[PDB]
Design a protein around this nucleic acid. Structure first.
Lengths: 94, 98, 89, 82, 226, 108, 94, 107, 81, 96, 226
DNA sequence: TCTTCAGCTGGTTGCTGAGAGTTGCAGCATTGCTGAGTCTTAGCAATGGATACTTCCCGATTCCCCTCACAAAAATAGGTCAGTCTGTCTGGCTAGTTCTGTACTTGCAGACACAGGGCATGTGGGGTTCCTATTTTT
DNA sequence: AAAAATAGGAACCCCACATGCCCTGTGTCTGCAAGTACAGAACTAGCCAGACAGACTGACCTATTTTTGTGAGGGGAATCGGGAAGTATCCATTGCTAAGACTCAGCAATGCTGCAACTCTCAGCAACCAGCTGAAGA
């Protein structure tokens, strides 16, 4: 009863979504949780840093938009911004 | 005459077996004694988690494998297959921390 | 700042490298400059004042005549001489 | 208690195993000394950073999370420990 | 900017070793896989294999195993296909085209085609050939055998020309294609939507799956305008 | 009124609210826009889906029904873009990619 | 006419107080401003990360002192903690 | 009462209130302590004073009045600790140290 | 529109950059490869810089954003802001 | 006439250029190059002079660091002449 | 932890040249300057020069230029002092000691001292000697000729023993020293104040400036207890 | 006529999966207000044309000095092997450390008067920078 | 004859110096909540202890890589010469960055709620044990 608050069941849900018939070890849960945390703090630091660059006190879709164009190289950037754009479009229409 | 292997094929065989094996190549007891050796000089009677010393472990074997493949590239560049300490010093110099 | 005549009196008081400039009458403050080491004095005073190009003796001659208008450090008619007053000594 | 002479605790066949993980065929007998020196300076650096992190935390037992942060200090991000 | 230089047609007697290049420029040559495909008048487009130049990783089709051979050259940014022991039924056009390493990615730009002349999921294009005026309503069905996680890509091929990429990930419009084209469907059933029609639409259309290792092309649909 | 999850509203699986909470308490700025957490969740699902799919292929061709971190390193090292994103990584319990040198191969 | 708000005059005053005669170019002022700013966001990011580590919503002298010990190597750390300790100690007396 | 600067109180030249303001709006923590800006002004005066001493010594050895960035390059590249601190930085018109290999010298 | 300015950096220019680094003798195959690595350095650095300038709705690229891009890349530059 | 032995002249400009601090690459072709390579991202950008100064000096610093790295790499192999194998090894160790 | 090993005593005829080492351990060798100082019984201590092994930078006193030569071995962490053309007025005890490259830092640790026998700014210590019991005040004066920006430190040496650092930057205590010692003064007037006196405190005391290139010691002061 | 094997009935001791309890956290309803979006215009730096000259670069020659091809050694390190010495993995047991819970407190945030330091500007002394007219010997 | 010494007009750079002004850091007051000294539950690190087995290591043979030497050869360093852009000022234009004024869209703050998540406990089931009863075998 310490409330570690990891992301193990959520990445478990997405892997059972994409690969329905494969199990996975807890070591890979540790690797993936460290990956999501490390990538998240990287891109969030870049987004806040870019918001400070433009004397802007907020982070919106435009700042994280430019920041994911920055950090993800090449075609990962364009595929990620396409899926993020359709995700925020579907959430906007609700 | 007993059957003896020519040099190199045992070396290539252990290259093949150690590039697909993932277990730790350093024994845990001397490594934790060594990190305790490091540990006295900063402060006295420190305490360590097992996960912590495995973390420093796999970090330092990753660092040494990176340094050794850099040493390999340096030795192949010198028209050689033998590594000497000057290869390690050159790799340490180009990587920037000397 | 006004370091010109002050340091010119200072190295004369210090007695350093007298082949270029030396004392002939310390009471009235006059002194006689050499015509050979003046280029060495030009380079030495240019590197001290931290200039951009090489100093010329004509340019220091241009600079030091402004003290005659103020009235402290003056010039008399004799070849390569220059003198102080009683106040600045 | 006090501890002494464990930098030679790593054996030269173990260094040979590390070399064969690094993909090199032939090594010399002189590589182990500066191997121990490089390994020495690497862990004294990371323990200096880690015990500084622990000493700010007012803790006496070094966890694994400050180890992950100590490896993240030099741009050597360590994974799977939290 | 992305260019795939290829050699010309060859008149080769059967049983001879043939090697042709796939020189590329305008982009980082190592960053993208290079695919290979041949097209026959009797079987249509048919995937051969691909090589990824970072590790020289090669994967070949099972029925082209041994016949096909891939080599890569990082120095000249060229990739070579080798054909050994030429069968008489090998007189076909050969295309090499660029594809990124993602399964979301597909074949975006294509070479001009080398017409070399010699002296598994069954996925099917349901409509055979459509006849239309300049303003009708057309829809092409690409029902497959098993399920794929939207790994479908639609291609338009003009006659004696390279195929052109239209849709990636079965719904998202490719760069340079106007919004008149749109893909739909997920899982096993799919549809391609074209609202406005012009004279340049008269071509042969294909859909391509890549959810499994052997890539299979569609039967082909010839659109006819006026 | 019935409350729907913002992940369900966006049609994703990662929690938008937890991301927004971590962004607000992450000392980035005192204002957070609406599209930033859902966009964050979208790129996170892209990265996790791609890496788990590559690990699934690495387990499938190895005839394993459980992903080991060796599959994770074989996924992350076999792409220049993934290696460029993860140049400074050390993955736990994974080993190293098997490669051989051209000179170290036998002549015959 | 836009209040550029640099650090030039403070480097000027410290330069005069410890070197009474040396001259100085404005290009070296640009170098100094870039240096002091780069050190500022480095040590401030370290202080923010260490404060977020121990669930601390405040930055006092202890964590940022630990950041000084982390960043500055060798004798710089002990001399800097000496100057900072002397400064905050005589400031506490006011 | 009479206004008195925290820099004047603490014997600092660097502005304590201004670095305090940059800590408040620098998005680092929701609260900030009193002694941290004094600590930062002290350590920044240490760093600037030390490398300005090395630059002034290099200028006095070269016999120049004015500090040039070449003197700053010779100041920071000739110290091991500064090179460890400032390894990954380039300097405007700094150049490099005069350094050749001994084998490149002729017999 | 401009073309083929990669050859604009003349042969003694690569020679003089070698001379700053202490290089004694230079083979003829060095020059084109140094042009290539110089080109890849420009393409990544200018890609980062143009992304920063497109974020701010500025079609004029500032030196300050160049310092930003080099500092993120790991080659922080001083004196330009 | 009198002709200098090879290497001595070369080390003379080694000595004068290691103490020099001015810029080495001509301004006009370099700004033409940066405009050409920036044309492909978005057409008709605009550059202030300080941006071109920053690019040029970052390029000079990166190239002189790379050249001293290739110097150590080449003199490791008991050679005084650099070849593209040396720059390939230097970029491989530095991670490019 | 830190060690500064030296060689033994030397019985040397005049006119020759003698090499002696200063092997050290317990710290990062390339990050610290190594200074050399000789001890004559009739002039006290005389600074020779220093070496910085990170770039092999040399600097010698003009009184000992030519006679003094420093050679450093980075591999064995050992530096070597070289005296050339030994005259009769060279019989002295030679010490090698460590100092950081920081100007605030001073000579923190010392070697045992090599006793070799042969077969500007002026610093003034005003009270040469004094006698005191075990509990009173004592004040030592270190007035200088020129202005020094608090770059002064005090040292205590026992007879036939290495010197020990007491203060650094004229106000801040060193490591391991008790709080009985307290330094004060800046500019040209400098003083050290000792709170309590013990039986081990009787020794010879020196103050060394490092605000200028010629490092000059004082005349010395012998302290007597009880 | 006794023992002995076997099953039923009743109570005990664990065992276990699902109904139920509990609690930290995301989402829903206002709100104001404040940072963000838009238009306008000043103004200031960037872009292109003009031109001289001056420094640099491109092109032919030489030669000489590195470097690569090749033979001999000869250090030097790899393949086997006998004895071993030490890592490890089991089980336990402290016991110094760490987390959870409170009071309170004390240092720090918000808001308003201000005024003194900081920024841009201009000016003035103290120097530099060229060149042309005048006068004494070497 | 002649050029170093001697004046001076006319600019030209730079380091302080003064001033307007402006704007933001000090100061004071009020509120308030994060950190902390203290106490106790728990928890896992270090140590202990023994069996055991397998990697370690010195020795040894041998093979083979490297180093040193010789030598041809060709590739670039050095040099001369002649053309060709680089650039330093000079201007015209223009466009595009940003300050300022205006208007308003969404988000921090507040409060309530409801499903989220394994957890807390529960009533029926599996095996254990003994009294009771009844059949089998001498």
């Amino acid at each position: 009863r310490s409330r570690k608050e990891s992301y193990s069941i959520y990445v478990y849900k997405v892997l059972k979504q994409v690969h329905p018939d494969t199990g996975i070890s807890s070591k890979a849960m540790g690797i993936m949780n460290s990956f999501v945390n490390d990538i998240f703090e990287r891109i969030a630091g870049e987004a806040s840093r870019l918001a400070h660059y433009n004397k802007r006190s907020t982070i919106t879709s435009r700042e994280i938009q430019t920041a994911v164009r920055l950090l993800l190289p090449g075609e990962l950037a364009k595929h990620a911004v396409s899926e993020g754009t359709k995700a925020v479009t579907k959430y906007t229409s609700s | 005459k007993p059957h003896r292997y020519r040099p190199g094929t045992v070396a290539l065989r252990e290259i093949r077996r150690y590039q697909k094996s993932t277990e730790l190549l350093i024994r845990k007891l001397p490594f934790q004694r060594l990190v305790r050796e490091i540990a006295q000089d900063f402060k006295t009677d420190l305490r360590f988690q097992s996960s912590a010393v495995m973390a420093l472990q796999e970090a330092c074997e990753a660092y040494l494998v990176g340094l050794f493949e850099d040493t390999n590239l340096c030795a192949i560049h010198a028209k050689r297959v033998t590594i000497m300490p000057k290869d390690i010093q050159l790799a340490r110099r180009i990587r920037g921390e000397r | 700042k006004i370091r010109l005549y002050q340091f010119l009196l200072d190295l004369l008081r210090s007695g350093d490298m007298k082949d270029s400039i030396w004392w002939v009458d310390k009471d009235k403050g006059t002194f006689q400059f050499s015509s050979k080491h003046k280029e060495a004095l030009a380079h030495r005073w240019g590197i001290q004042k931290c200039n951009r190009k090489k100093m010329t003796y004509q340019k220091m001659a241009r600079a030091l005549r402004n003290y005659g208008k103020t009235g402290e450090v003056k010039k008399v008619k004799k070849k390569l001489t220059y003198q102080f007053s009683g106040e600045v000594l | 208690k006090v501890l002494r002479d464990n930098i030679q605790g790593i054996t030269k066949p173990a260094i040979r195993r590390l070399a064969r993980r690094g993909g090199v065929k032939r090594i010399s007998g002189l590589i182990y000394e500066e191997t121990r020196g490089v390994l020495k300076v690497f862990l004294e650096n990371v323990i200096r950073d880690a015990v500084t992190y622990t000493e700010h935390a007012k803790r006496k037992t070094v966890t694994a999370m400050d180890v992950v942060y100590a490896l993240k200090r030099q741009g050597r991000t360590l994974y799977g420990f939290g | 900017e992305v260019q795939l230089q290829q050699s010309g047609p060859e008149l080769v007697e059967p049983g001879t070793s043939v090697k042709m290049p796939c020189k590329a420029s305008g982009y980082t040559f190592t960053s993208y896989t290079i695919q290979w495909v041949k097209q026959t008048p009797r079987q249509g487009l048919e995937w051969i294999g691909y090589i990824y130049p970072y590790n020289a990783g090669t994967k070949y089709n099972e029925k082209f195993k041994g016949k096909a051979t891939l080599t890569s050259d990082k120095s000249s940014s060229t990739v070579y296909m080798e054909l050994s022991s030429l069968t008489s039924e090998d007189s076909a056009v050969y295309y090499c085209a660029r594809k990124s390493s993602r399964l979301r990615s597909t074949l975006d730009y294509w070479g001009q085609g080398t017409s070399v002349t010699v002296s598994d999921i069954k996925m099917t294009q349901s409509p055979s050939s459509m006849h239309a005026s300049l303003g009708e309503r057309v829809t092409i069905t690409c029902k497959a055998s098993q399920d794929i996680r939207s790994y479908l890509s639609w291609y338009q091929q003009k006659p004696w020309k390279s195929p052109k990429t239209l849709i990636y990930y079965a719904t998202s419009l490719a760069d340079g294609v106007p919004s008149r084209f749109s893909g739909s469907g997920s899982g096993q059933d799919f549809s391609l939507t074209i609202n406005n029609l012009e004279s340049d639409d008269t071509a042969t259309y294909y859909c391509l799956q890549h959810g499994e290792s052997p890539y299979t092309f569609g039967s082909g649909t010839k659109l006819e305008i006026k | 009124a019935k409350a729907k999850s913002r992940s369900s509203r966006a049609g994703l699986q990662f929690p938008v609210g937890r991301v927004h909470r971590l962004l607000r308490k992450g000392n980035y700025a005192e204002r957070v826009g609406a599209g930033a957490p859902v966009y964050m969740a979208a790129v996170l699902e892209y990265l996790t889906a791609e890496i788990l799919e590559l690990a699934g292929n690495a387990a499938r061709d190895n005839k394993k029904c459980r992903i080991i971190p060796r599959h994770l390193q074989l996924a992350i090292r076999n792409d220049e873009e993934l290696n460029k994103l993860l140049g400074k990584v050390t993955i736990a319990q994974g080993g190293v990619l098997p490669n051989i040198q051209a000179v170290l191969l036998p002549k015959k």
